[PDB]
Amino acid sequence: SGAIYVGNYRVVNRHLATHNDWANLVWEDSSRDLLVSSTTAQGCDTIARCDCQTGVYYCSSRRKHYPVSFSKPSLIFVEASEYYPARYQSHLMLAVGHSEPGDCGGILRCQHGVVGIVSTGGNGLVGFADVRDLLWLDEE
Numbered sequence: 001s002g003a004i005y006v007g008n009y010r011v012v013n014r015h016l017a018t019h020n021d022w023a024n025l026v027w028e029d030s031s032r033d034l035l036v037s038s039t040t041a042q043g044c045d046t047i048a049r050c051d052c053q054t055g056v057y058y059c060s061s062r063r064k065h066y067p068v069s070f071s072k073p074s075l076i077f078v079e080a081s082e083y084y085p086a087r088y089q090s091h092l093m094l095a096v097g098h099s100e101p102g103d104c105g106g107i108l109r110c111q112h113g114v115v116g117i118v119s120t121g122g123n124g125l126v127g128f129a130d131v132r133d134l135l136w137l138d139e140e
């Protein structure tokens, strides 16, 4: 589990969104595993506006923050699971690292702020859904 709190927005994995999230929906994209909903209180996270390929992520299955190298956001094939059929997930970045399904929501961050959240894993790799192109998150 886990979310990014920026201004009056809550950014979560779409496969983990609750009722309140869908009711107060701002934007969602199944092909990115992302969902943004409105909030009443202000969040304090800052989104990274950069092309960094190194950072640190939180792994709840290990209670540890790992420094990683990650690939640029791409269209990656993601096997079928209990949440989606086999499909291509867009804006996805991979790193060599440990993850389990319950790790989704863990923040990936660089010196500039939040880069994205854990979304995929398996085969000794961890996938993060990029949020750095979502410029509207800093305004309105």
Ligand SMILES: Cn1cc(NS(=O)(=O)N2CCC[C@H](C(N)=O)C2)cn1
Pocket (backbone or CB within 6 Å): 015, 033, 078, 079, 080, 081, 083, 084, 089, 099, 100, 101, 102, 103, 104, 118, 119, 120, 121, 122, 127
């Ligand atoms: C973070 N993590 C997720 C997994 N397992 S997964 O890659 O099958 N994953 C299951 C939950 C939905 C994910 C998606 N975005 O399609 C795929 C392992 N580690």
Ligand SMILES: [Zn+2]
Pocket (backbone or CB within 6 Å): 048, 049, 050, 051, 052, 110, 111, 112, 113
């Ligand atoms: Zn950066």
